[PDB]
Amino acid sequence: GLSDFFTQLGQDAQLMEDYKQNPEAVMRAHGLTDEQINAVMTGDMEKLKTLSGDALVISHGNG
Amino acid sequence: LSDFFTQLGQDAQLMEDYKQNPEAVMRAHGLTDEQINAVMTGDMEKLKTLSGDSALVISHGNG
Amino acid sequence: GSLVCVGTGLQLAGQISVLSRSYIEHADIVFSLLPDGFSQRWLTKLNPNVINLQQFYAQNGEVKNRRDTYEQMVNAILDAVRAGKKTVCALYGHPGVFACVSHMAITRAKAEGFSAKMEPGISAEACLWADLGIDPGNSGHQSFEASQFMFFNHVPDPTTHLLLWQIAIAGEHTLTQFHTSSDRLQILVEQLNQWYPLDHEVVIYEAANLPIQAPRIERLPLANLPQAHLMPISTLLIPPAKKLEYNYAILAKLGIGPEDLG
Amino acid sequence: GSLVCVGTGLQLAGQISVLSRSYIEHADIVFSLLPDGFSQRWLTKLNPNVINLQQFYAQNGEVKNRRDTYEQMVNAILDAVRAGKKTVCALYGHPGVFACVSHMAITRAKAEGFSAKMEPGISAEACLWADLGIDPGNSGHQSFEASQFMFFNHVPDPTTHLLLWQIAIAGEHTLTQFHTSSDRLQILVEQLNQWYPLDHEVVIYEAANLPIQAPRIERLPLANLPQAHLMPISTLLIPPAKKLEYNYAILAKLGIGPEDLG
Numbered sequence: 168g169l170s171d172f173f174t175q176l177g178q179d180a181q182l183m184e185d186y187k188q189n190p191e192a193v194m195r196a197h198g199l200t201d202e203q204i205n206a207v208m209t210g211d212m213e214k215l216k217t218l219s220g221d222a223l224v225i226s227h228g229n230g
Numbered sequence: 231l232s233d234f235f236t237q238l239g240q241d242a243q244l245m246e247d248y249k250q251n252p253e254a255v256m257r258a259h260g261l262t263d264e265q266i267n268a269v270m271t272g273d274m275e276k277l278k279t280l281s282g283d284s285a286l287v288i289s290h291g292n293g
Numbered sequence: 294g295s296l297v298c299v300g301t302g303l304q305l306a307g308q309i310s311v312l313s314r315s316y317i318e319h320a321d322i323v324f325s326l327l328p329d330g331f332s333q334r335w336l337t338k339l340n341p342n343v344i345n346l347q348q349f350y351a352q353n354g355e356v357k358n359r360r361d362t363y364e365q366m367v368n369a370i371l372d373a374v375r376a377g378k379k380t381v382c383a384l385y386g387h388p389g390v391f392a393c394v395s396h397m398a399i400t401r402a403k404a405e406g407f408s409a410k411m412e413p414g415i416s417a418e419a420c421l422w423a424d425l426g427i428d429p430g431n432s433g434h435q436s437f438e439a440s441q442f443m444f445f446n447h448v449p450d451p452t453t454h455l456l457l458w459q460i461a462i463a464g465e466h467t468l469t470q471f472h473t474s475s476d477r478l479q480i481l482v483e484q485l486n487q488w489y490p491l492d493h494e495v496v497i498y499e500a501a502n503l504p505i506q507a508p509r510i511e512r513l514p515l516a517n518l519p520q521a522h523l524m525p526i527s528t529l530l531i532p533p534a535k536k537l538e539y540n541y542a543i544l545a546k547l548g549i550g551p552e553d554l555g
Numbered sequence: 556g557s558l559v560c561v562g563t564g565l566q567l568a569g570q571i572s573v574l575s576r577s578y579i580e581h582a583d584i585v586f587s588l589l590p591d592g593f594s595q596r597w598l599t600k601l602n603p604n605v606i607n608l609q610q611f612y613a614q615n616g617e618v619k620n621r622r623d624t625y626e627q628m629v630n631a632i633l634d635a636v637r638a639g640k641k642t643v644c645a646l647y648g649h650p651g652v653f654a655c656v657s658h659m660a661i662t663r664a665k666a667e668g669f670s671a672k673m674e675p676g677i678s679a680e681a682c683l684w685a686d687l688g689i690d691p692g693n694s695g696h697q698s699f700e701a702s703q704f705m706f707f708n709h710v711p712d713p714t715t716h717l718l719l720w721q722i723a724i725a726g727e728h729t730l731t732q733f734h735t736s737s738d739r740l741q742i743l744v745e746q747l748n749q750w751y752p753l754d755h756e757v758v759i760y761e762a763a764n765l766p767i768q769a770p771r772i773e774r775l776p777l778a779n780l781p782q783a784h785l786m787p788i789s790t791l792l793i794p795p796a797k798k799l800e801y802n803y804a805i806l807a808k809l810g811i812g813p814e815d816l817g
């Protein structure tokens with residue numbers, strides 16, 4: 168649900184432009200809950216992951 | 231030529247096939263001997279002449 | 294067996310190259326290091342045979358040097374290749390930007406006589422220029438690893454856009470911590486005060502990983518950096534401190550001057 | 556109307572992002588600036604409504620400032636947006652890397668109250684790291700527009716990898732010529748001689764545009780640069796002239812020593 172939507176949105180310029188116009192409308196149409204929408208609107212990435220389920224350093228400066 | 235290069239550039243399967251046996255893959259797609267020669271000699275200019283399609287600068291630094 | 298290292302970018306699903314996506318699809322096995330789980334799911338749908346490199350990072354407040362983590366990563370990758378698997382390494386952003394694993398793997402693979410190459414991807418730097426609408430060519434560009442800029446001798450050009458990567462672990466010398474302290478950041482501030490004033494506006498940038506996510510562009514005086522909220526994915530942008538001054542010496546040799554500049 | 560500037564990368568067809576390709580596909584109109592006619596055909600088949608920006612460059616040994624060219628380029632793009640067309644600008648590599656058209660189009664678009672953004676692409680820089688297997692974070696990275704390095708005061712760090720873009724027109728002050736001269740490049744050598752010996756190995760890099768084309772990686776002494784065959788798409792790589800030396804000043808403040816480095 169949430170995962171499939173994000174995946175498609177990030178790939179489809181058509182849907183992306185649709186999202187830009189009306190985020191809530193598009194999200195609600197893809198069956199995102201109110202809490203999921205709220206998280207998006209408030210930009211609480213943390214919650215988004217919690218509602219979905221479940222280090223990025225690949226280098227150093229010590230030579 | 232144009233049809234082959236576009237495919238090759240996009241298709242990783244075809245790419246890996248090409249690097250396995252360039253001449254085999256090129257002949258398989260119906261490239262002429264001269265066209266193949268141009269590729270092996272790395273004569274990009276001739277490839278264009280054979281494709282009929284005979285300024286990349288988009289910036290300055292004078293302030 | 295062979296090795297192809299690709300980048301997926303920072304955005305989910307959409308910021309990977311067409312060719313790089315194709316490599317993952319037809320790969321026998323994929324070694325992944327992606328930002329989040331959404332990205333991990335996406336990958337698994339492309340190719341089910343995925344091994345997560347994340348597993349080689351310290352587990353449970355364990356003291357582990359990242360140099361060992363990276364070495365374990367490289368070994369795992371090569372193991373697949375040595376077995377005869379058409380191996381693909383999928384790292385976020387550009388696989389060869391502030392990422393040694395890929396470079397190391399390709400190097401070692403070649404030395405053992407295996408086909409290995411790297412496909413370019415969209416790095417956090419690429420995302421920065423676009424999000425902030427800054428051209429690196431405008432007044433030039435400099436990039437340094439934050440800790441290397443402190444441990445070694447680096448002199449920045451204060452007329453260029455300066456990027457300090459991995460600002461989150463700036464001054465973390467052991468390579469076993471995943472964040473530094475405010476005291477370490479204060480020393481860095483003091484060091485930067487050689488070329489940049491304390492009230493110099495800097496920018497903490499964080500490219501979005503999700504299509505519904507807005508990037509982080511936090512502007513603040515250099516002085517407040519030590520008290521700022523930093524994350525591993527945080528990049529510090531230090532804009533020019535001075536403007537471009539003319540170089541008469543060279544202009545003269547060129548036999549021209551400012552008024553002659555087109 | 557709206558504007559979206561995208562990059563198509565350097566390689567044909569396969570080096571564009573999945574999202575950016577999508578934008579080109581669903582665009583009402585596309586303004587293009589591609590390296591060759593193979594990339595031009597590819598684009599045309601993706602979206603037929605294409606206007607090539609190449610037309611605004613000087614035609615027939617004409618004397619025309621590139622400032623005017625870019626202006627005419629920006630104006631052509633905006634006309635579409637003001638018309639109401641969902642406009643996409645497809646530039647090669649990264650749209651905002653050493654490219655003023657996009658940034659100028661986006662800035663003007665916003666000012667006129669239009670929606671305009673820039674999607675990051677794969678730049679010649681990104682390709683260089685992958686082709687030469689060099690990590691910009693290894694010892695640091697600096698980029699400068701050749702001519703700007705000559706005209707204005709830039710101090711490079713000899714420990715970092717240094718890139719000089721548009722080396723082919725280094726010293727071309729009129730902005731009317733497509734190439735410089737050996738006498739100009741000779742002065743650049745003397746300039747670089749402040750930090751780099753004359754026998755310092757530099758690399759002329761040219762990323763391939765076709766999947767059957769190998770990249771150009773010519774190694775030669777800095778002194779022979781003036782006699783080197785340069786093309787518009789040529790970038791000059793200047794490897795580190797010195798190795799990283801410990802910064803005892805900062806190490807002392809951190810209360811650590813070289814042997815304490817992880």
Ligand SMILES: Nc1ncnc2c1ncn2[C@@H]1O[C@H](CSCC[C@H](N)C(=O)O)[C@@H](O)[C@H]1O
Nearest residue numbers: 386387390391416417458459499500526528
């Ligand atoms: N989403 C993001 N936004 C901004 N900077 C990021 C980022 N992800 C990584 N970085 C930067 O990159 C560092 C990790 S090194 C790996 C970077 C990655 N290969 C790339 O191509 O960008 C971080 O410490 C941070 O400085």
Ligand SMILES: Nc1ncnc2c1ncn2[C@@H]1O[C@H](CSCC[C@H](N)C(=O)O)[C@@H](O)[C@H]1O
Nearest residue numbers: 648649653678679720721761762788789790
């Ligand atoms: N195929 C290529 N290989 C190497 N460098 C290239 C190149 N095409 C362009 N360049 C570099 O880019 C300069 C033009 S400025 C345009 C750069 C483009 N936006 C990008 O993303 O790379 C050239 O003078 C050269 O320094």
